[PDB]
Design a protein around this ligand. Sequence first.
Ligand SMILES: OC[C@H]1O[C@H](OCC#Cc2ccc(-c3ccccc3)cc2)[C@@H](O)[C@@H](O)[C@@H]1O
Length: 158
Amino acid sequence: FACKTANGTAIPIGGGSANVYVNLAPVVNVGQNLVVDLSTQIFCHNDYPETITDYVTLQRGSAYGGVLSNFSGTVKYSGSSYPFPTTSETPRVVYNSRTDKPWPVALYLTPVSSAGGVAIKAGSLIAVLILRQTNNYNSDDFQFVWNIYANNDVVVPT
Ligand SMILES: OC[C@H]1O[C@H](OCC#Cc2ccc(-c3ccccc3)cc2)[C@@H](O)[C@@H](O)[C@@H]1O
């Protein structure tokens, strides 16, 4: 089991950490959501699906910088909503193919009432999302840590 972003940035068998740069809607209105959809950038696969089934959760999610200060949010994992920062571990998603499939995580972030102007700065750390992988074969229990950075500024009008 291993993961990557499609520009080639990989986290190999056994886990590790990687950085992900996300394009963000440059204008987000109060009352509406900034959607940081990591399922369009983070992909994973099972290396031996004929023998082993892999199980993948969102173990931990938290916000940083302007996301932490200027937005409040939830995280959707595999079709369901959870508080952000996360509390419980999510249900597992099964990975059973050598063909990469997305890690189905997205943040839904709405500006706080006092937000206005440049609310997220280009280059800043905005989130850390941790994927936990286990399987039905042995005791492997690996963390894939995704450090999420803003590729661009986000402005909240007014
Ligand atoms: O994505 C599948 C697995 O890939 C990595 O482990 C590599 C392996 C293996 C493997 C395959 C077959 C056997 C095997 C042993 C005895 C008899 C038959 C098959 C043992 C280990 C590692 O990332 C595991 O955590 C993950 O579940």
